[PDB]
């Protein structure tokens, strides 16, 4: 008889419940910790799963090392396990596929296999608002990208360039950080100046003069508050009863209400032209099933596009200034190109002359190689996926992670990858280009293959549509900085390390450079 063993099981359960509170709590942490380690050992035997990085603290996983030094985390994992490995991250299992085969696996994954929106909806919907980007089916997103891409034409860039130039010169004249009419040298924190210059130039060109005008008021404080809600904490705490979350929600309503006010005003007066992205979305925002975007969804889409382009672009111009501050040779080279292309400054900068400035564009390209703003791109796995040429199966409910920025820093693909060298792009200054066949997901033909080791703008259905706007904006900014200023580091200082815990891989603050006017007697006119 072993029914006596079943009696003692019941007896033991009854004695378990009688344990004093110090031991029941002690067991409350001892039991999961022990079972978590037991489970990892058994998992390591599965031949149809990638290796899983070992971790001590249940639920948390490798969150700390990944959050603070992700590329160092990937490099060590890659040496132990190779290019495919999983790790636990705050309750999720992330499967990483490093290198160009991983770009192909994740960026070209089938629509039914993976979902970006299920990975990101909690990050962006609380900031942007409902009904756009990740708060909608993929076919809706594909068409929103088509709508936005319709204000981003060559002829739009031709009119944006003088407007962006005006904003940069205004900033040089009026900002406390410069005041070029009264100061000939000064010190700036580039993580103060670049977010400001970026919002001013992106507002004037994409949003128009009215929304730019609002940035000269206390309304600008709403942008700061909404900006602060764009943070990785939303992956864990998207809504908490705190002032941070309520200033964010207030800003989203106030800002989108301001966009809707302008929109309803324009169509009240039939004042709908071809000036900015607001006009474009007012004329071209009907989905292919006949449904029109509402004014709320148009406003939420403007917020999302401006907020993403704000963070990637401002981080990138910060890094450009920081790399050039220790490279007066590159500043000199760029300056000579400006004098040649613009006939000593007697030519006005135009979008077409921007295309004749290869070294300037290679500097943006090289900065995006060394500082990809988004160190990791996620998808949630919706159907079990077989990893080709392996026995691995990534089950549904995992997440896949692709990191083109990690491959950007591999000597195998970019010799001396940790050295900033714009000439590695000689005869190849295009922001990107399809090396062969093309495909259309809804917003234009893009490269069909995504195995290039350089992918600053991603690829596949979720590929960036802001690339040409970003180059135009960054090119005008840097053209004007180069012609107007020389700059260098305070003594002893150098390029700062990246801060990987924020939404983009921005420089660790404070990152100060000292500027000096090239022409101390140059005056910037206007009121
Ligand atoms: C240096 C500047 C930029 C970089 C490096 C960059 C990079 C990227 C990358 C890597 C993706 C792919 C995301 C993924 O696969 O999960 C992406 C998507 C996207 N980006 Fe950008 N971007 C930049 C600027 C901009 C600008 C200026 C805009 C808007 C004008 C913009 C709008 C978008 C949009 C709408 C998507 C589509 C997201 C999706 O389909 O899921 N980006 N970008
Ligand atoms: C989802 C978000 C993101 N994805 C991954 N890691 C960090 C991130 F912030 C992002 O891809 C960033 N981004 C890309 N180009 C500009 N911004 C994004 C895309 C479209 C958008 F309308 C707004 C937006 F924030
Ligand atoms: O001239 C083409 C124009 O297309 C419109 O839809 C956009 O609003 C403008 O940004 C662009 O300049």
Author numbering: 7 to 533
Give the text the authors published on this PDB structure.
However, no active site water molecule was detected within 5 Å of VCZ in this 1.9 Å resolution structure, and the VCZ was displaced slightly towards H140 and helix I by <0.5 Å. There is also a significant impact on the disposition of Y126, which neighbors Y140/H, as the 5-fluoropyrimidine ring of VCZ was flipped 180 degrees between the wild-type and Y140H mutant structure. While the ionic interactions of the heme with K151 and R385 were retained in ScLDM6×His Y140H, the loss of hydrogen bonds between Y140 and the heme ring C propionate, and between Y126 and the heme ring D propionate may be expected to affect the electronic status of the heme.
Phenotypes and high-resolution X-ray crystal structures were determined for the surrogate enzymes in complex with representative short-tailed (voriconazole) and long-tailed (itraconazole) triazoles.
